Design a protein around this ligand. Structure first.
Ligand SMILES: CCCCC/C=C/C(=O)SCCNC(C)=O
Length: 281
């Protein structure tokens, strides 16, 4: 084009009308908390988490205009580098007070991932801070999480923010009653230049989890469907259940739900599921 890439001019004339169409929000906007809640739900329900293009090791491009093109025009899915900053930029231009902050994810094994490679939004409405995450693979909060003390109930799950070992830590209350971390964050506002390093980290990583694997998920009302390789986690109204996917037929049934409304991604996703299952046998 004639408008240089990365310029404030490029990101300022992005057609947000088409973005709200992409995430299925055909209403009026104001800056109330109720509008924030509906935008967040719309994005979570409309955009699946998918890392398909990086199965290669091919990195994402980071521009707002490039995320916008992939997500809005090609109607691809999202993740923490391609969805969350763009959503934060849209909210900024719609008048919300928004801050992008880095996070570190808690492994199922029971430890932190080595890098602080997640991103989160904090939105300030009427002098309260609200957490937002539109780029997370597994189970997190589907309504904005108040940065305040004590359990917060959502869809039969209990979430909380609490200061643990010096960091605000988002946890989830398990079936027993014990709490498990989802991730911790730092209140350190990020720009593109501050989280760029993440691409190099996974490029130069031995065995990055976002390369050579199948990772996708979809919020549904009251839960989420998460596919990790040959496993499916179905979170529904305070319960999670697990199923081992045995046949490509079965994986394709499930990928059609996860990618409902995104039928153009199913073949690629089914190919990736087979190529990933093979490459661990
Ligand atoms: C350059 C190819 C790979 C893309 C780089 C990573 C992107 C992300 O989405 S980083 C969040 C990853 N999640 C955990 C637990 O590490």
């Amino acid at each position: 084009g004639l408008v240089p890439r990365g310029s404030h001019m490029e990101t300022e004339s992005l057609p947000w009308r088409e973005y709200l169409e992409r995430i299925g929000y055909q209403g009026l906007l104001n800056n109330s908390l109720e509008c924030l809640r509906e935008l967040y739900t719309a994005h979570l329900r409309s955009v699946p988490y998918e890392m398909l293009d990086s199965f290669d090791g091919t990195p994402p491009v980071l521009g707002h205009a490039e995320s916008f093109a992939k997500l809005v025009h090609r109607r691809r899915g999202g993740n923490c580098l391609e969805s969350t900053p763009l959503f934060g930029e849209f909210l900024r231009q719609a008048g919300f007070e928004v801050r992008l902050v880095p996070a570190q994810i808690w492994k199922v094994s029971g430890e932190w991932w080595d890098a602080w490679d997640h991103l989160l939004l904090i939105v300030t409405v009427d002098g309260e801070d609200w957490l937002l995450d539109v780029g997370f693979l597994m189970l997190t909060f589907a309504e904005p999480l108040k940065v305040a003390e004590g359990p917060q109930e959502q869809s039969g799950w209990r979430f909380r923010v609490a200061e643990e070992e010096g960091f605000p830590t988002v946890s989830h209350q398990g079936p027993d009653g014990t709490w498990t971390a989802v991730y911790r964050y730092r209140d350190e506002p990020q720009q593109r230049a501050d989280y760029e390093w993440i691409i190099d980290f996974h490029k130069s990583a031995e065995d990055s989890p976002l390369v050579g694997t199948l990772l996708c998920s979809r919020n549904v009302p009251d839960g989420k469907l998460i596919m990790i390789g040959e496993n499916l986690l179905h979170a529904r109204n305070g319960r999670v259940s697990a199923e081992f996917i045995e046949t490509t037929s079965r994986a394709e049934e499930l990928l059609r739900v996860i990618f409902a409304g995104h039928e153009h991604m199913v073949e690629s996703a089914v190919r990736t599921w087979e190529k990933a299952r093979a490459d661990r046998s």
